Symmetry: C2
């Protein structure tokens, strides 16, 4: 059974990947966001949805989890979804400005503001992607993100969270925080995933070298055939 | 039916992708090599092979096609193959030195020399990946690559070529050149693919924005579900 990583373990594994293993961020971020779009398309196939193209709002935060979201949005569009992005706080780095341009060239619209009421979100988007905070955030949720999470917590439509539900303690979870219907753990699940309450938990990010898996005792499941996700039941 | 691109068209589309669209090379190279490993695993599944782990020799050339090969090798290992790489001429750029390190950390061995006889290649490797020359090469095949192609042309085991069979005119093919059993066209097929004589032609590189597909009249086939390849019949 797969290892659930502490924040310190997650950070160690990441340090190795981008340093000794010499993977680049945009490379693993590409594979991670592809896994996210893949898990979404598996859990909520366009046929299962009442809108042809199904609508999705992807909300991207100010760090790497936000980047995973941008890559996720672009693959969802290729997979037959109709994504909209809300990306209020963007790092001033070419990685992210390039990702945004890519989404714009995919004809994915960016919102200028978040709808202020859950009912409006419910009415416009069949699914909401939470790409707000990742496993490095240790907190004080400041604004614009506190009120965004407040709206998310009132939604009727499902939320899919990338890696960790935003606003959860990376190890401890958060009983009173958002409760995503889908979680995509990237690389290996974090300890907070033991508190996951939704229907779908997928592992994604099929790039972990066997040597790293062995060193950290990750005990990854076997991804089937050529798939980049695995459904954890 | 899909458009088969001229060299000039292929180069235009590439210029757009990496310039106006602001995709990065390592990003599309990741997706391209993943599609290659995926097509290989579909056409030659490990179960269909007489060796548990199936052995594969991936021969990487001095440009981007060589890079696609390196990414291909690493995903093949994750897919359950036992790759070996021969990479005689390597650009002095971090893109490629990083890819090599990644393959080394995947425990993929690099050969110091090419076996000089087809029989030896046949005996050691169940499949040979031709990642030697891509659609930018306009020629004189110099050495070490001329004698490598001479050995390849004598093989009994199948060759899978990335994008274009190395040594073929990118538009005209080459009746007397290598005859791969699998071709993975990347982005859109090139005119040389009309001369393809093998059993398996896959399209890969599922990243083409609809606007670019429209502008160049690519008429891409519909990739099924979340797959990153499509079998062209
Ligand atoms: Cl604040
Ligand atoms: Cl020479």
């Amino acid at each position: 059974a797969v290892k659930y990583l502490s924040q310190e373990e997650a950070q160690a594994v990441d340090q190795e990947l981008f340093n000794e293993y010499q993977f680049s961020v945009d490379q693993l971020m590409e594979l991670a966001g592809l896994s996210c779009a893949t898990a979404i398309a598996k859990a909520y196939p366009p046929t299962s949805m009442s809108k042809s193209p199904p609508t999705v709002l992807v909300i991207c935060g100010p760090g790497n989890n936000g980047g995973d979201g941008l890559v996720c949005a672009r693959h969802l569009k290729l997979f037959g979804y109709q994504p909209t992005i809300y990306y209020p706080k963007r790092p001033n780095k070419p990685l992210f400005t390039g990702l945004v341009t890519q989404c714009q060239k995919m004809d994915i619209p960016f919102l200028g503001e978040m709808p202020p009421e859950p009912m409006m979100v419910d009415e416009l988007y069949e699914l909401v992607v939470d790409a707000i905070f990742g496993f490095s955030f240790k907190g004080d949720v400041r604004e614009p993100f506190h009120s965004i999470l407040s709206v998310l917590s009132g939604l009727t439509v499902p939320i899919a969270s990338i890696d960790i539900p935003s606003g959860w303690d990376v190890e401890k979870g958060n009983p009173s925080g958002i409760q995503p219907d889908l979680l995509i753990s990237l690389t290996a699940p974090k300890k907070s995933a033991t508190h996951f309450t939704g229907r779908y938990h997928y592992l994604g990010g099929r790039f972990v070298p066997p040597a790293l898996e062995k060193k950290y005792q990750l005990n990854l499941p076997s991804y089937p055939d050529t798939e980049c996700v695995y459904r954890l039941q």
